Amino acid sequence: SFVGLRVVAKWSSNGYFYSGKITRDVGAGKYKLLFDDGYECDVLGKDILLCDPIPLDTEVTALSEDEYFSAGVVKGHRKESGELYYSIEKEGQRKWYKRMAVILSLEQGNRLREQYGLG
Amino acid sequence: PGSMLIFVKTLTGKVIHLEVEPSDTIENVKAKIQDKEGIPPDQQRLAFAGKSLEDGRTLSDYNILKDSKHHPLLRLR
């Protein structure tokens, strides 16, 4: 019932959360996750956020065109034939980012755990 | 120390994060990628925004590192 769901998940204790999909409940409190970036691994359920899309006004980390990740705030989303884009504001300026360009720092993901954490 | 956060995208597409100092050499960064991802440095060609980063320079030599709020994504190729 969690299988097939889109999530944002981290795979290290101090790492970032990345978008992906649950492909199997594998037990020992773990889920096999296929990240949009291609990496697949078994992640602890505590490190999975069941939020898709990431909600309005969430603080995220997004990859700008200049190839720097930096913090911004989600201000909207658009789904264009399968693909999700986020509108993210940084210092007053909104740009559109692909789903896989939007990640969460440990603190940013921790903010979402009570509402969207798996368990 | 004055360490800084960078990201690296591997050939598989997997993104990792590293802590680096502005004084680290590219070889040192490859050694950190090796330590985390097991990718031998002999397999590793790094670039930032499409510019090759060559052994024996530092990140600062390339003007890659800014403030602590902007984390560059290096890409392996």
Residue numbers in the entry:
A (entry chain A): 1485 to 1603
B (entry chain B): -2 to 74
Quote the paper.
An alternative way to improve HDR editing rates is through downregulation or inhibition of key factors involved in competing NHEJ and MMEJ pathways, such as 53BP1 and DNAPKcs (NHEJ) or DNA polymerase theta (MMEJ). In this study, we leverage this functional screening system to assess focused libraries targeting the protein-protein interface of i53, an engineered ubiquitin derivative, and its binding target, 53BP1. Using targeted saturation mutagenesis at the i53:53BP1 binding interface and a screening process in primary human HSPCs (a cell type with intact DNA repair, DNA damage sensing responses and other cell stress sensing signaling pathways), we identified i53 variants that introduce stabilizing interactions with 53BP1 and are more potent than i53 at increasing HDR editing outcomes in HSPCs. Using these classifications, we determined that the addition of i53 variants results in an increase of HDR by specifically reducing NHEJ events but not MMEJ nor other types of outcomes, consistent to their role as 53BP1 antagonists.
We then iterated on the sequences of two top hits from these libraries (L67R and L67H) by varying the amino acids T12 and T14 simultaneously, which revealed changes that could further increase the HDR-based readout. These included the introduction of negative charge or, in the case of parent L67H, a positively charged histidine at position 14. To understand the molecular basis of the improved activity and binding of the de novo i53 variants identified in our screens, we solved crystal structures of each variant bound to 53BP1 (S2.2, S2.3, S2.4, S2.5 and S2.6). We observed that the L67R change enables a new 2.8 Å H-bond with D1550 of 53BP1, and that L67H forms a network of inter- and intramolecular H-bonds, including a water mediated H-bond to S1554 of 53BP1 and an H-bond to D64 on i53. The new interactions identified at position 67 were also present in the crystal structure for T12V.T14H.L67H and T12Y.T14E.L67R. For T12V.T14H.L67H, additional stabilizing interactions were observed at positions T12V and T14H: a water mediated bridge between T14H and Y1502 and Van der Waals contacts between T12V and 53BP1. Interestingly, the T12V mutation alters the polarity of the interface, resulting in displacement of a water molecule and formation of an intermolecular H-bond between D1521 and Y1523 in 53BP1. The T12Y mutation forms additional Van der Waals contacts at the protein-protein interface.
